[PDB]
Amino acid sequence: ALYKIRTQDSWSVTAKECPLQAFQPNLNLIPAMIGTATGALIRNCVRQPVIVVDDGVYMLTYLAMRGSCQDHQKSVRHFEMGVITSDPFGDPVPTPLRHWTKRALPAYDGCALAVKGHAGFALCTETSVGPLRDRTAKRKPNIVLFKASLVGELSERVIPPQSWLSGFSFFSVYTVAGKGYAYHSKFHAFGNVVRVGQSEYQAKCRGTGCPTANQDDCNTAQRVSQEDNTYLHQAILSVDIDSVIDPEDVVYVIERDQYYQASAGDLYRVPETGEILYNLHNGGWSNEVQVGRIQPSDRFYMREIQLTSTRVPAPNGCNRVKGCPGGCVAVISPAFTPMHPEFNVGVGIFPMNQPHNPSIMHVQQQTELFWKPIVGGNITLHESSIACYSTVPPNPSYDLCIGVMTLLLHQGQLPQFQALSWYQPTMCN
Amino acid sequence: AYPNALYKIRTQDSWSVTAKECPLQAFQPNLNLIPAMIGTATGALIRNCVRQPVIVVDDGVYMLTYLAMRGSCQDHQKSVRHFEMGVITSDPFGDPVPTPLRHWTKRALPAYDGCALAVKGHAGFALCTETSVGPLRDRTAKRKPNIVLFKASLVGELSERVIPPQSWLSGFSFFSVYTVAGKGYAYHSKFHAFGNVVRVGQSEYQAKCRGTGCPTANQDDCNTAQRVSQEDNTYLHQAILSVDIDSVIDPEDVVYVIERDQYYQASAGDLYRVPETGEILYNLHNGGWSNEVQVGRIQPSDRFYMREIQLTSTRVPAPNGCNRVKGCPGGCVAVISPAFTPMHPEFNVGVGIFPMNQPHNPSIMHVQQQTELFWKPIVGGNITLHESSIACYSTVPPNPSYDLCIGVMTLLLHQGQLPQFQALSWYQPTMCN
Known part of the structure; x- marks a missing residue:
């Protein structure tokens, strides 16, 4: 492989515990x-961007x-x-080694990514007309x-x-779509499940998002089929990555009392402790920044963590x-990664101003750094994924973060893939 | 099951002798x-800048x-x-589009300037100048x-x-x-590409x-435009580099010098080899004083001649503000953005990427024997074209x-930024009129 630097998760327990500098x-x-x-x-369009980093290797x-x-x-x-390799300035930047494409049909939608030990993993839904029509049908x-892998295998x-x-x-x-992790011969990622209530x-x-929300409207927001009484549930997929014969593939369903609406999201595993953090993306009615910890006990709970009170904006035309x-x-652009084993600190890519310009937000326990x-x-952000x-x-x-985005670069065109890296402040105040 | 070396569309050069001879349709x-x-x-x-883009295609493989x-x-x-x-593989619509399989980077120092490309089978070749501060300062120093x-190669190591x-x-x-920078060709055991050599007059x-470019041109001004060092009386000559690509033991690398009466100024360029006949066509890029679209044929006789071919009378524009x-x-x-590829074994037909209008917008020009198709x-x-390379x-x-063409360009997409890499493909009209 190309001479690459060692890297480690920014949500390791070795991260800063101090109150951080406002940079x-x-x-x-x-x-x-x-x-x-x-x-x-x-006029080509790009959707569902995901970036994941593990020990100097990205997918x-x-x-x-x-x-x-x-x-x-x-x-x-x-x-x-x-x-991720040192550039002429001595700065670690990512560079591609292998690239593959899958030509539909069939199409592959909502792919989740993980990297472990120079290996890459992707979990996708085989479809023709997409998940919205697949559920209705x-x-x-x-x-x-x-x-x-880096040697070109898919x-x-x-x-x-x-x-x-x-x-x-x-x-x-x-x-x-989103980020997952590979631990103990298993590929863990967010999923969606259609199930009867x-x-x-x-x-x-x-x-706090909608104090007077009506329960019937909330149930409707989750419903898939009125006649069948089916609801779209958030789930955790545990996929076997070592066995090809008699593989053990598990789906862990989270009850719909743990989330306003099922959505795409990211799972993060604290390397030392094994605790699982999550970032539940928007796209539904809730405009809160949804992060927290996955606690498996008598059932799978999503313990919400208060990261920021800043709300996710609506599209321009919506009044x-x-x-x-x-x-x-609430738009689907925001994506937040943890910089702390308990998500006390987070960094995210966020839409700013009326054109939804791409921006970077640093928050610590509801304090905007x-x-x-x-x-x-007029550059407009559509989707984003961040790896720090x-x-x-x-x-x-x-720390170092890699941000990948889909952006409307010019009027009359379609969302374009763009990427950038930056030195992320971790200094104490 | 994905685009790979064995699962690719077969292609052939658009300057093959099998190309159209008829007067073409103006599309x-x-x-x-x-x-x-x-x-x-x-x-x-x-604010990242991209320079010297080159694209080459051979039998469904690109570099x-x-x-x-x-x-x-x-x-x-x-x-x-x-x-x-x-x-190059068939896309969901049945259209052949290029897709990447391998990518490599070389981190300066040292830098690699003016790389020429060639593709043969599944192997790719690049000939670059090892430098630190670039060719202009290298010549002066x-x-x-x-x-x-x-x-x-697609499945091998760089x-x-x-x-x-x-x-x-x-x-x-x-x-x-x-x-x-530009396109070359790999045939048999040799990699042939354009070069520049500093040589005494x-x-x-x-x-x-x-x-026709400058009817009133002055010989003294023309000689000065080619001169490198007046003290040493050295001039920048166009050359053809013949590099051994098969031998690792005793490699034979040869330089063929073209005398400076065959070109207005030495420059970057592209070489094309007609597969059936073996005749060599060239596209001499701009960036000097000549604003002509410079194409022709390389004829080795008693010495190396560059036989000009009159492709189009449209002139290459100057940068904004030059009076x-x-x-x-x-x-x-004359700006260096234009790049023209032959659609004919004798360059009777050409397709090029060209700057149009005051912002020098990227454009495609189809010309047949000085007729604009x-x-x-x-x-x-306000998108501005800087450099381009085209493979049909x-x-x-x-x-x-x-025919099918792939265009790679460097463009100023937004004000306050730097030239960006962009690419596109298109169906190139070859129908008769």
Whole structure:
């Protein structure tokens, strides 16, 4: 492989416990020449970007389409792996080594990524017309595990819908875009499950986001089929990455009382303790920044963590109610990664100002350390994924983050893949 | 099951003798621009600059290169040289598009400048100038640079072979050898590409001067435009580099010098080999005083001749704000963005990427023997084209109406940023009129 630096998770317990410096100066934005050009001049669209880093190795994915952003049937699914290496300035930057594409049909939607020991893993939903229509049509999709490596291998294992192990019955299982982890021959990632409602568990509803939310509206926001009384559940997928014969693939269903709405998300594993942190992406009615800890006890709980009170904005044209089940949607752009084993500190890519310019937000226990735009003007952020890491040994003042985004660079075009890296302040105040 | 070496579309050169001989249709409708998701993102938001883009295609395999810098476009010392290889495969719509398989980077120091590319089978080749501060300062400092041959393949490892300046075999005497960006070809055991050599002036040969580009050109001004060192009486000559790509033991690297009466100024360029006949076509890039689209044929006789071919009378524009003379020595420069590829074994037909309008927007021009078949913008607005490279091919068997072209460019996408790598493909009209 290309000479690469050792890296370690920025949410390690060795992270700062102190109250952090509010970094006033401009950030040092360094290159991240990864991915590919995505037709900035010829109306090509990119969706579902995910970036993951493990010990100086990264894996990247996105979904490319022609002429619009809703063409799963004619989409191309991109996978990429590379290493983080010291650039001419002595700065660790990622560079690609291998790239693969999957040409639909079939399409691959909601791919989750993880990297472990120079190996890359991708879990995708095999589809033709996408998850929204798949649920309404009551399909039972195949799920495909991709195994990638720096020497150019891409192996696939089909997971039939009936093969999943679970303690209860469910209609169907879907993958969702985001970050996962590979631990103990298992690939853990967020998932979505269509399942009939049970009396004991109702929709999470009233809270600081919408104190007067109505329970019937909350249940409707989660419902899939009114006649079948099925609801879209958040889940954790535990996929076998060592066995190809009689593989043990498990789905852990989280009851719908643990989340306002099922969504895409990221899972983080604290290396020393094994605690699982999560970042539940938006796209529903809740405009809160949803992070927390996964606590498996008598059942799987999502213990919410208060990271920031800043709300996720609505699209430009929406003038309806904000942050309540019957109004505007909260955009899907925000993605926050933990800089602390208990998510006391987080760094995220966030939309800023009316054009939703891409920006970086540093928050510690509801204190905003900084909120800085990457660019101004009319550049609009659509989706983002962020991977922050530390060197071995850590820099006493900085961690490094890699941000990948989809952006509307020019009017009349479609969202474009862009990437960048930066030194993330970790100095105490 | 993914795009790979064995699962790729077969292609053939668009300058094959099997190309159309007829008078071509002037294509009025808009072109069908199809994806070319190659290269990488190049920091469109963080002021990163990309230079010297080159694309080459051979039988469904491509190789790409460019030079990346941080914070400015004049930082060889802190630059990164990118290499990439991939295949041309049928996209979901049934359209052949390029997709990357391998990517390599070379971290300065040392930097690698003026890389020329060639592809044969599944192997890729790059010939670069080992430098620290770039060719202009290297010539002024009278350095003798190393030249490095890079060997890449889709399933193999990137190897390098250093060519010392004293190791070159040649029939001529010269001071130093430089590579230049552009396309070359790999045939049999040789990698042929354009080069530049610093050499003392010869009594018999003066600078090419008066012509359709500058009817009133002055011979003294033309000779000055080619001169390197007046004290040493050295001039920058165009050359052809023949580099051994099969032998690791006793490699034979040869320099063929072209006398300075065959070209207005030495420059970067592209070489094309007609597969059936073996004739060599060339595209001499701009960046000097000549604002003509410089194409022609390389004829080795008693000496190496560059037989000019008149492809189009449209002139290459000058940079914004220049009020000196156009297309004549000692005045405004002609921008280096244009790149023209042959669609005909004798360059009767050409397709090029060209700057159009005041912002120098990227555009595609189709010309046949000085007749403009079309001149269409890719985009308008304030997007500015800086450099470009184009590779057009055929599907085997050829589509009766269309060839396929891949265009790679460096563009100023947003004000306050630096030139960005962008790529696109399109169906190139080849139908008769």
